[PDB]
Amino acid sequence: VQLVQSGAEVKKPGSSVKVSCKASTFSSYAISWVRQAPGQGLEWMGGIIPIFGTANYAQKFQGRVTITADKSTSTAYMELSSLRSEDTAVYYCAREGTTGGWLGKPIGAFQHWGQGTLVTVS
Amino acid sequence: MEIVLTQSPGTLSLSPGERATLSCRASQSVSSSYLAWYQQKPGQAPRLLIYGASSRATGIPDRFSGSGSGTDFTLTISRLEPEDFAVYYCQQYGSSPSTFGQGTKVEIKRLV
C-alpha cells in the first residue's frame, strides 16, 4: 500500500488547483483529503469510497472542493477553487487502515498517507 | 455540528527518559471511542500511533499507550526516546466531519 501524490504547485489567487493521489484494493476503501498550513496543524476536507463514486465533504469547503476517483488508474483527485492565501498548505491524501486482504476489517483511522502536495497561493 | 478537539499543552519540553503525557479534550463525547493519535516529524507525513482510543497500530512500540473515553483522552509515552521528539495530533472519526486537535509539540528541554 503506497499513496503517491502530484508535485508542488504555486497558484494565483482566485484560480483552482487539482491534486492527484495514486494508490499502489482501491475501490473498496475510504480515501480522504487532509491539509496543513505553515506553522491550523491538520484539517479534514472530505473523502470518497471509489466504488460508490460520490464524495462526502466538510461543510467548510462545500461549494469549492471537488473530490473524484478513477478505478482504472487507482487515482483519487481533489480540486479546490477560488484560491486564497489562507489555502496555502500541504494537502495530503490518506487511506484508512485495515486489520488485514479481505480478512481485514477497516478501522477508520488513517494508516496510510501520501507524501503530501505543497500548494502555495501567491 | 463538528466536534472540536483541543490539545494541551501547546508545547511539552522534556528530557530523554522522562514520561510524556499529552491530553485531547473534545467538545462533545466521541462516538465509540473512535479516537486516534498521530506522530509527525518536520517535512514528513503523519504516522498512526493509536486507534480506537487505546489500540496500538502495527509496529508501534510498547512505550506508546492511549486511554480515555467520553471527552478526555490521553496519549502517554512511558519513557521518551530521542526519536520521539515530534508533534502529536489527536483525531476523532466517530462523527462527520472527522476533526483533528491542533497538535502538541514535544521538544527537548533547553540547556540550564
Residue numbers in the entry:
A (entry chain H): 2 to 25, 28 to 52, 52A, 53 to 82, 82A, 82B, 82C, 83 to 99, ...
B (entry chain L): 0 to 27, 27A, 28 to 110
The article reads:
An effective HIV vaccine will likely need to elicit broadly-neutralizing antibodies (bnAbs) that target the viral envelope protein (Env) as part of a protective immune response. Multi-log improvements in affinity for ESs were the result of improved off-rates or combined improvements in on- and off-rates, with a small number of enhanced contacts to antigen observed in the crystal structures.
The total surface area for red and orange hydrophobic patches is shown.
